């Protein structure tokens with residue numbers, strides 16, 4: 600089971616052009632929104648989270664309860680959390696593609712012989728790095744996308760391609776949740792199959 | 793410039809189910825069709841061809857005039873052509889993704905220090921391995937897809953996902969060529985932007 604779990608904020612540039620804010624430095628364009636974080640935890644519960652190196656680095660520390668697999672260039676130093684934590688498993692892009700495309704891979708701890716099997720029965724959530732998300736979409740069983748809307752502009756250093764959201768909209772939407780976070784913020788979490 | 797150049801044959805299984813034949817062992821489901829091979833050469837002319845390991849192995853020898861880049865697991869032996877030829881450059885999936893997603897990578901010859909730059913101005917054709925094709929589609933500038941139709945069933949060991957062809961059909965078709973190859977064979981080459 601492969602689930603995509605990500606968020607974005609449709610916003611405007613200083614000149615009024617549209618853009619889909621995805622990342623802001625080592626954080627999020629909309630900052631820290633309680634409901635957003637709560638939804639994330641519920642959606643990733645009981646799954647093995649897969650993310651890119653910068654996504655792992657953006658974490659203040661390991662998220663409790665879930666295994667963190669990081670896809671990165673192993674020829675470089677291991678990426679760590681803001682608190683210095685290492686991931687449970689680090690895999691190459693080749694392993695990542697072999698897995699999401701329907702294969703099975705063996706993952707091993709970073710500084711230990713321990714290794715286990717990640718196959719098509721494993722429950723996985725792909726969360727960070729548009730590259731990882733775009734690569735997994737054709738093989739995903741479920742897509743959980745959140746749209747955070749702010750009254751005023753939000754900045755970003757990483758954006759999402761509108762074509763990506765378009766490809767997702769082709770899928771069957773089966774669930775949608777809308778929340779008035781505050782006077783200038785709304786959050787919509789939608790589930791596609 | 794990223795161009796996808798691939799072919800398939802919409803056929804039926806022994807029980808009448810539909811399937812998109814893509815590969816047959818180390819060859820093609822429809823065998824060797826002159827026009828198909830001629831089209832391939834014209835479409836890959838002046839470009840750097842990128843393919844997976846088995847695709848490289850399916851080649852009787854290096855295709856004259858074009859650089860062959862093979863994306864594979866470098867922890868394994870170098871894949872060679874049916875004639876024993878090595879590719880001009882071998883890169884990892886990480887390098888492949890970094891490139892197609894908009895980056896720049898440095899490629900080096902297999903058994904020599906030589907290395908060069910592959911960037912967004914390079915002219916590339918992604919041809920073999922559905923995994924490579926699915927990964928490049930969201931970043932492609934052009935898609936050249938050929939549909940070979942045989943009167944009678946063709947076998948295959950590798951197939952294409954109908955969703956892939958569906959995603960392509962969303963693009964603007966700008967060219968289409970249909971040929972009556974023979975009494976039981978037709979070939980349609982279509983170009984999407």
Ligand SMILES: NC(=O)C1=CN([C@@H]2O[C@H](COP(=O)(O)OP(=O)(O)OC[C@H]3O[C@@H](n4cnc5c(N)ncnc54)[C@H](OP(=O)(O)O)[C@@H]3O)[C@@H](O)[C@H]2O)C=CC1
Nearest residue numbers: 605606622623624625626651652653654671672675727728
């Ligand atoms: N749902 C959401 O909205 C989410 C947003 N984010 C946000 O995403 C942004 C990060 O996006 P993005 O960069 O695409 O993320 P990825 O995790 O996809 O990519 C991380 C990058 O870091 C580099 N890298 C590769 N290997 C290593 C290594 N071993 N050590 C250190 N660095 C390495 C590479 O650099 P290079 O580019 O040079 O090849 C790679 O492109 C952040 O702002 C984060 O807050 C994160 C999760 C979810």
Ligand SMILES: NC(=O)C1=CN([C@@H]2O[C@H](COP(=O)(O)OP(=O)(O)OC[C@H]3O[C@@H](n4cnc5c(N)ncnc54)[C@H](OP(=O)(O)O)[C@@H]3O)[C@@H](O)[C@H]2O)C=CC1
Nearest residue numbers: 798799815816817818819844845846847864865868920921
């Ligand atoms: N347009 C078309 O219709 C085209 C069709 N083809 C056909 O495609 C078929 C091959 O498809 P596919 O297998 O998806 O192709 P790819 O080239 O995508 O994959 C080759 C595979 O070979 C393995 N491999 C990885 N690294 C190495 C290595 N270093 N040495 C040896 N093997 C390695 C892997 O095995 P593993 O699965 O174990 O991870 C990988 O999955 C063929 O039948 C070919 O004729 C080829 C080009 C074009």
